[PDB]
Design an enzyme around this catalytic site. Structure first.
Site: not given
Ligand SMILES: O=c1[nH]nc([N+](=O)[O-])c(Cl)c1Cl
Ligand SMILES: *[C@@H]1O[C@H](CO)[C@@H](O)[C@H](O)[C@H]1NC(C)=O
Length: 351
Positions: A145, A253, A297
């Site tokens: 993540s 995701d 996730h």
């Molecule tokens: O931890 C994260 N989870 N999701 C995202 N995203 O944009 O989907 C991002 Cl940038 C980070 Cl740093």
């Protein structure tokens, strides 16, 4: 179990100024070292960091960390659970800097919080050299993540650090899990007026300033001042990196869908299908990758990480094939990207 060590250099701190640290399980005789970066989003101004301090304090402070943790998934020392690297030296680096592992700023009279993620990684590496890392053959910097994005932001700096310290024989590699995001159009839109409505590009742009965030040098030189946020997006930073990096990313995701405001009619069907196609496209020229067509996730430190397969190959197998490739291989593939267009079209997706 992995045992906690707080950093001996207590100037390298979590957000609230408490010492950062790492959990270690040594494996005598193994010259493989796995350094895993925990994830957990980020915060980007005083107000949203204050909220995170109230209800996610372990992500901002070491004061309540336990003395030990159990290694799971790729951090497990049981071959049954971890066919890939069960005998490696295992290091879990807690995420307590809220900066996607990019920060280089101390708490001061002008800073309520310290954002030291990039310095935490460097300090862990330095202190591990005295604990056996000096003898390593391979250092795999892995993370999930925000920790996966952290791998992309830091793997080449770890490589440079070891070279400058006089250890050119340690092969530094990266494993970025669930940290490969798209700066795409949201399914429904909102201007960045508060935390919820702020898209990651704008939150990261603000965060870099708030954190004194740093990005890899070649990517920085391409995008230049004001545009370093681009380097937080895998498909833009990856081509600039010198260290070998294996990319693990679900095509659908859940964090990507969350920032895209997806929580099925034709418009949403097309949006989801386009997202998977775009993700697949960004991985076309990533030779070491594992990208199943699942809405998930779930992360590589989960105990059942062995179960998912792409084209009949599990991730532990693909990682083993990657190791062999760094010494194509008959029956040992490393580029595994699903082509089916809808979540769970792969029957092995997590339930
Ligand atoms: O931890 C994260 N989870 N999701 C995202 N995203 O944009 O989907 C991002 Cl940038 C980070 Cl740093
Ligand atoms: C402690 O960490 C800080 C910040 O990374 C660094 O400037 C300093 O040189 C370190 N001190 C020692 C003794 O390693």
């Amino acid at each position: 179990d992995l045992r906690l060590h707080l950093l001996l250099n207590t100037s390298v701190t979590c957000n609230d100024g408490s010492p950062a640290g790492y959990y270690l399980k040594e494996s005598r005789g193994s010259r493989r070292w796995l350094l895993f970066l925990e994830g957990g989003w980020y915060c980007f101004n005083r107000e949203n960091c204050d909220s995170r301090y109230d209800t996610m304090r372990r992500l901002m402070s070491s004061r309540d960390w336990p003395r030990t943790r159990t290694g799971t998934g790729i951090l497990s020392s049981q071959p049954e659970e971890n066919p890939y690297w069960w005998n490696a030296n295992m290091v879990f680096i807690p995420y307590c800097s809220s900066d996607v592992w990019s920060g280089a700023s101390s708490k001061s009279e002008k800073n309520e919080y310290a954002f030291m993620g990039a310095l935490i990684i460097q300090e862990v590496v330095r202190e591990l050299l005295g604990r056996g890392l000096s003898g390593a053959k391979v250092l795999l910097l892995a993370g999930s993540s925000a920790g996966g994005t952290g791998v992309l932001l830091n793997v080449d700096r770890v490589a440079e650090q070891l070279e400058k310290l006089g250890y050119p024989a340690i092969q530094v590699r990266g494993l970025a899990d669930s940290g490969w995001f798209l700066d795409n159009k949201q399914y429904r839109h909102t201007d960045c007026v508060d935390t919820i409505t702020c898209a990651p590009t704008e939150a990261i742009r603000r965060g870099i300033r708030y954190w004194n965030g740093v990005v890899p040098e070649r990517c920085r030189r391409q995008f230049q001042e004001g545009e370093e946020w681009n380097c937080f997006f895998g498909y833009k930073v990856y081509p600039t990196l010198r260290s070998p990096v294996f990319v693990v990313q679900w095509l659908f995701d859940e964090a990507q869908l969350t920032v895209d405001n997806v929580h099925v009619q034709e418009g949403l069907r097309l949006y989801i299908q386009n997202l998977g196609r775009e993700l697949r496209h960004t991985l076309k020229d990533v030779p070491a990758s594992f990208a199943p067509a699942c809405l998930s996730h779930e992360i590589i430190i989960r105990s059942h990480w062995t179960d998912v397969q792409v084209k009949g190959t599990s991730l532990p197998r693909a990682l083993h094939c990657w190791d062999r490739s760094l010494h194509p291989l008959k029956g040992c593939p490393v580029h595994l990207v699903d082509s089916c267009p809808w979540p769970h079209c792969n029957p092995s997706c997590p339930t």
